[PDB]
Curated annotation (Swiss-Prot):
Homodimer. GO terms for cellular component: aminoacyl-tRNA synthetase multienzyme complex; cytoplasm. ATP binds at residues 141-145, 152-156, 226-228, 263-265. This is Proline--tRNA ligase. It is an enzyme of class 6 (ligase). The lineage of its organism: Eukaryota, Sar, Alveolata, Apicomplexa, Aconoidasida. Consists of four domains: the N-terminal editing domain, the N-terminal catalytic domain, the anticodon-binding domain and the C-terminal extension. The first domain (about residues 1-163) is required for editing of incorrectly charged tRNA. When it is deleted the enzyme shows pronounced misacylation of tRNA(Pro) with alanine.
Length: 491
């Protein structure tokens, strides 16, 4: 029992998340705060979604590349609105060994200024457009807020795409094309539902025209979290970096640029969504070992021979599996050993050999059933798909039951204290965002996230807008509201 999870997911969600990521061999802690080690089980998930996202962006003619880790002061402060948001979190290298550098250099929090410093040399005519680039790297944002593995780290793996188009229509089209790819990223591989929306003016990317987002929600602690982002930068970065091109009428024009990113935070959202009191729970598309086979003891040689036959037919069908034949541990140990590591299927094998069958157990609901030997391949093929849809449909229902539509403010704190979001009519005035955050944080006297702010913030203006009444006013200012917006506590 001590080798398993000792904290229930409902009781202590913070301690539960720490035990799950450690005992499943996903995360190892480090002697630098905010930095964590991705063990092979965690990095394998990253390679899976990386192989999917690569194949999809090649269809859009996006090409991979790598740009330097460092940036000078001259290039970093080109755009005013972009550096003002990143300035206190930018890490600076100031010396080599014991000798100071002739000029200080900064570690990339994002590669806008690094990549766009050389775009004018690549973009000179309309023939050089569209320019589409992507990187798979890490960036460093040295914040002093409470770190959490995967989702809130000072260094994080991600991809960052950067495109440049001839007009606004072509760039905005790619923004929402990428945004839907992020939806397939979370749905088809992590089984996590998301909400597409537009960020408010006070929550959009520095130097961007608008920011499209994919929002997720953690229902155990009532915290939303941005799953991915896709910005339409317009001509803002093109003006400060002088990224011009001569059009087909011999007139100089600014390019319409986009930037979009999705990090390993996607892995943490998956853990908080499907993890249970038994440990990690993994969708099949991001799990290395699909099935685990545990013997139960007469004739020991007959059980070893029978268990290896299932591992043979499973590996023949391109389904990687593992047979835990460790004689130093009981089956009960092996049961909890792989349930903590998120193995989707366990096949248990003396009476089963006499019946020429085996006990196939699911990880999501622990539903066991007898399956004959010759009919175990097809039964395990479909159970993988059924486990993936069950994890997504259950997560979709918990997401739907998390949004509460409100028309005033006297019903907002009740929904927040119920671990819910709120869909309220809003005038979208940027001045009201700080007013709502300060007031909701003041009224938050009953939380127990001691490291997360009790304030609620504008999450996103959902693309799926419900009908708007003619005289519906703003829930905060009372002015004529414009659209519905999602508010709530976030990561
Ligand atoms: O951001 C991260 N770390 C920071 C450093 C640190 C250090 C300690 C504690 C917190 C943080 C925070 C991050 N970390 C691990 C994995 N992924 C990450 N990023 C993302 O998932 N990204 C997509 C959402 C983007 N959100 C915004 O730009 C905000 C939201 C609206 C207004 N602007 C950020 C990029
Ligand atoms: O950090 C961001 O939000 C944008 C998107 C990826 C590159 N820069």
């Amino acid at each position: 029992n001590i080798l398993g999870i000792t904290s229930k997911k409902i009781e202590n969600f913070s301690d539960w998340y720490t035990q799950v990521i450690v005992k499943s061999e996903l995360i190892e802690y480090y002697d630098i705060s905010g930095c964590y080690i991705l063990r092979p089980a965690a990095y394998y998930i990253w390679e899976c979604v990386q192989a999917f996202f690569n194949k999809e962006i090649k269809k859009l003619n996006v090409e991979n590349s790598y740009f330097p880790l460092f940036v000078t002061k001259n290039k970093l402060e080109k755009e005013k609105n972009h550096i003002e948001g990143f300035s206190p979190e930018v890490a600076w290298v100031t010396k080599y060994g014991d000798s100071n550098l002739p000029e200080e250099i900064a570690i990339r929090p994002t590669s806008e200024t690094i990549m766009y410093s050389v775009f004018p040399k690549w973009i000179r005519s309309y023939r050089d457009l569209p320019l589409k680039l992507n990187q798979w790297n890490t960036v460093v944002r040295w914040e002093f807020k409470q770190p959490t593995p995967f989702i809130r780290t000072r260094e994080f793996l991600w991809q960052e795409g950067h495109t440049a188009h001839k007009n606004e229509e072509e760039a905005v089209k790619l923004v929402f094309d990428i945004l839907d790819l992020y939806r397939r990223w979370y749905e088809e591989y992590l089984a996590v539902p998301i909400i597409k929306g537009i960020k408010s003016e006070g929550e959009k990317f520095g130097g961007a025209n608008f920011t499209s987002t994919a929002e997720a929600f953690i229902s155990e602690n009532g915290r939303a979290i941005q799953a991915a982002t896709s910005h339409y930068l317009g001509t803002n970065f093109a003006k400060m970096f002088k990224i011009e091109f001569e059009d087909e009428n011999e007139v100089k024009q600014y390019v319409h640029q986009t930037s979009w990113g999705c990090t390993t935070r996607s892995i943490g959202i998956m853990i908080m969504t499907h993890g249970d009191d038994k440990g990690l729970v993994l969708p099949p598309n991001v799990s290395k070992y699909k099935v685990v086979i545990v013997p139960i003891f007469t004739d020991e040689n007959a059980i070893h021979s029978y268990c290896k036959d299932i591992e043979k037919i499973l590996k023949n069908a391109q389904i990687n599996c593992v047979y835990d034949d460790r004689a130093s541990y009981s089956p009960g140990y092996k049961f909890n050993h792989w349930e903590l590591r998120g193995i989707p299927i366990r096949i248990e094998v003396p009476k089963d050999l006499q019946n020429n069958s085996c006990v196939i157990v699911r990880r999501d609901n622990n539903e066991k059933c007898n399956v004959k030997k010759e009919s175990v391949l097809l039964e395990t093929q479909q159970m993988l798909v059924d486990i993936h849809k069950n994890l997504f449909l259950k997560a979709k229902k918990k997401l739907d039951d998390s949004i509460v539509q409100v028309t005033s403010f006297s019903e907002v704190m009740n929904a927040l204290n119920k671990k819910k979001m709120v869909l309220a009519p809003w005038c979208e005035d940027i001045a009201t965002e700080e007013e709502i955050k300060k007031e909701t944080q003041r009224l938050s006297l009953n939380q127990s996230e001691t490291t997360l702010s009790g304030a609620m913030k504008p999450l996103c203006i959902p693309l799926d807008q419900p009908p708007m009444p003619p005289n519906m006013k703003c829930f905060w200012s009372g002015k004529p509201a414009k659209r519905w917006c999602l508010f709530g506590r976030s990561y």
